[PDB]
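Why run this: before we spend reagent on co-expression, it is cheaper to look at a predicted model of the complex and decide which construct boundaries make sense. The entries below are exactly what would go into the expression plan.
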Amino acid sequence: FLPFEGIAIDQGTLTLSFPNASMPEKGKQATMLKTLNDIILHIRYTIK
Amino acid sequence: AEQAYRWELNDDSARFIKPGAWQGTYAGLLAGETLMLSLAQMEDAHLKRDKRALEVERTVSLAEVYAGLPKDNGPFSLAQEIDKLVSQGSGSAGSGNNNLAFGAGTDTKTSLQASVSFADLKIREDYPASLGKIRRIKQISVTLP
Amino acid sequence: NNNLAFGAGTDTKTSLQASVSFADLKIREDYPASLGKIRRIKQISVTLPALLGPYQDVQAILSYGDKAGLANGCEALAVSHGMNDSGQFQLDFNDGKFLPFEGIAIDQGTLTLSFPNASMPEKGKQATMLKTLNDIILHIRYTIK
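The model came back. Tokens follow.
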């Protein structure tokens, strides 16, 4: 089974995290995060 | 195999393997034959219950979701709060279950995370039910602009 | 039988649908018989010349009226891609299973396509997307033997 298979659309909480994000501490991704307009999810779901 | 079946259909009350094929008295013979009967039953019920379902894709942008929260709850523009929260370790944004903040755990404190509830997406609104009574996510793939 | 209107059922009242009879298409007129005495539909793929903004999805359903011939769940095809796509995720011939709309006779039936949330008077996600439409285009793959 692929990750996230079989999950119900109705409930749950999905989270996306980026490591080394804070700028106060030198973080590899401080720059890569500032570029983002948004995050985009491509959800392929099944109806039956 | 029983579990993978109880997963492929949402039906979790499925009981296809009953104790016990093996017997203390007797060799425990016919245990194998008995099991393969139950497996044959599982496959039969499975084939009768299989459906070439409606396979559908829906695309969702987090920013749209964050901006779309009702007035009572706290909505935001994603780009801004990301930038703000990168600059100060302190930052946080959004109502519970649709929040954006830094990680709680000891390893993940420096990491920044976005959160969405599938509930708030209200994807059931895309198609009338009927047809769909059960909606299963086949695959998730992420695009980052 | 070649009408375009709102849904009959309680769920699909707001949804707008188009309908055609395979008969009126006279697809049998494309090729003389002989060779072909029996004509079976191998696969249906829908292309919609409609203009949608990035990160926008079509919601639609292909239906067949009779369901006289059977297959499970193959009576219905969900289209979200909108540019040439078979229903479902990666299309597979040499698939152990029959594709939706396989085995159907070209001569009879009623094929229907519905777009949910079509009414503009009531707020509908696809009202704008529908106004862009010039038409609906069907790629029908059939078999002669």
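The radius of gyration of chain C is 16 Å. Residues 112 and 122 of chain C are 23 Å apart (CA to CA). Bring this page to Monday's planning discussion.
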